[PDB]
């Protein structure tokens, strides 16, 4: 069983690590944006410190280790991200080296969801603004700068509505067979694949996540059939985005990882920021550049 009192554990661990100089929060500023062409909401984060920047999980510094084991099995460590933008940003990393190009185990995806659940005690979408994204950057094109398997868990912003939400609104959880495939928003430019999840975690077992993933991965795989994709997970839904380049073309040339594809863009350069702000649709075009054409 996954550790309890987890959130308190991460938080306590975090302030301590921040206090002690073991991890450095990237200074950043974020504002909302609306794509005037596609309606998509964007959350743009400016972190110019990062423009400075041009297996760390092997023997992690002990101060960054939240739990040396996570479940009963010797399977997982939970780590603090050492260079977070969003505070308390964490890492679910395999006890033993397993490839960053490796696909997620059913227990991979299943352990993730539990971490999500530790973190939001629910009680409503209409009670709290607390909320969390799980993501996995898989393959050279996905934004992965790292080769060891790591699932990332980080707070999402308080008033922000990623397009996936509006996609799954209404829309009972299911799996593609014949009528409706995984959901795809036809307004945006990039191929992506989504399915809603049961409103109750009561209904969420390692089996359902497993099946959801695989089928999403089936549709996203056809974009090759080298191999890279993003995986996004929230309590409300799960998403898979086939991926072509790690870095967008000419207008902006943004390094985009998993976050981009729910609309959260990390910008390291002022001009680009100002360009985005002037014309938010360019984000959508960048997402095309790093991705594949929207197939909806």
Taking CB under 6 A as the binding criterion, the range among 123-131, 181-189, 193-201, 253-261 that sits at the site for ligand B4P is 253-261
Nearer to ligand B4P, 79 or 208 (CB): 79
Residue selected from 264, 276, 287, 288 as contacting ligand B4P according to rule CB under 6 A: 264
Nearer to ligand B4P, 78 or 85 (CB): 85
Taking CB under 6 A as the binding criterion, the range among 183-191, 199-207, 229-237, 255-263 that sits at the site for ligand B4P is 255-263
Residue selected from 265, 273, 287, 288 as contacting ligand B4P according to rule CB under 6 A: 265
DSSP letter string, 219-271: HHHTTT----EEEEE-SSEEEEEE-S-SB--TTT--B--GGGGGTEEEE--HH
Q: Taking CB under 6 A as the criterion, which residues in 38-67 touch ligand B4P?
A: 45, 50, 56, 64
Taking CB under 6 A as the binding criterion, the range among 34-42, 74-82, 108-116, 191-199 that sits at the site for ligand B4P is 74-82
Handedness of CA 124, 125, 131, 135 (dihedral sign): positive
Q: Taking CB under 6 A as the criterion, which residues in 135-164 touch ligand B4P?
A: 137, 143-146, 150, 152
Nearer to ligand B4P, 50 or 287 (CB): 50
Does residue 81 bind ligand B4P (CB under 6 A)?
yes
Nearer to ligand B4P, 208 or 220 (CB): 220
């Amino acid at each position: 069983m996954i550790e309890e009192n987890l959130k308190q554990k991460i938080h306590d661990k975090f302030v301590a690590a921040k206090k002690n100089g073991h991890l450095k929060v990237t200074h950043a500023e974020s504002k909302k944006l609306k794509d005037p062409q596609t309606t998509t909401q964007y959350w743009v984060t400016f972190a110019p410190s990062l423009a400075l920047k041009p297996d760390p999980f092997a023997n992690p510094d002990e101060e960054l280790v939240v739990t040396e084991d996570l479940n009963g099995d010797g399977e997982y460590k939970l780590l603090l991200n050492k260079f977070p933008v969003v505070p308390e940003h964490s890492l679910l990393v395999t006890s033993e080296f397993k490839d960053q190009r490796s696909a997620l185990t059913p227990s991979d995806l299943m352990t993730a969801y539990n971490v999500l659940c530790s973190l939001q005690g629910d009680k409503d979408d209409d009670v709290t603004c607390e909320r969390y994204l799980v993501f996995y950057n898989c393959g050279p094109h996905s934004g992965s700068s790292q080769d060891h398997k790591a699932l990332q868990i980080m707070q999402m912003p308080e008033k922000f509505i990623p397009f996936q939400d509006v996609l799954c609104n209404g829309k009972d959880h299911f799996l593609p067979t014949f009528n409706a495939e995984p959901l795809q928003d036809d307004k945006v430019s990039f191929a992506h694949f989504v399915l809603p999840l049961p409103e109750s975690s009561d209904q969420v077992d390692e089996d359902l996540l497993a099946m959801c993933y695989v089928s999403l991965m089936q549709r996203a795989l056809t974009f090759f059939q080298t191999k890279s994709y993003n995986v996004l997970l929230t309590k409300k839904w799960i998403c898979v985005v086939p991926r072509s380049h790690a870095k967008s073309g000419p207008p902006l040339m943004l390094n985009i990882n998993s976050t981009g594809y729910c609309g959260m863009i990390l910008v390291k350069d002022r001009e680009k920021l100002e360009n985005l702000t002037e014309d938010p649709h360019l984000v959508d075009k960048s997402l095309l550049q790093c991705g594949f054409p929207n197939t909806a």
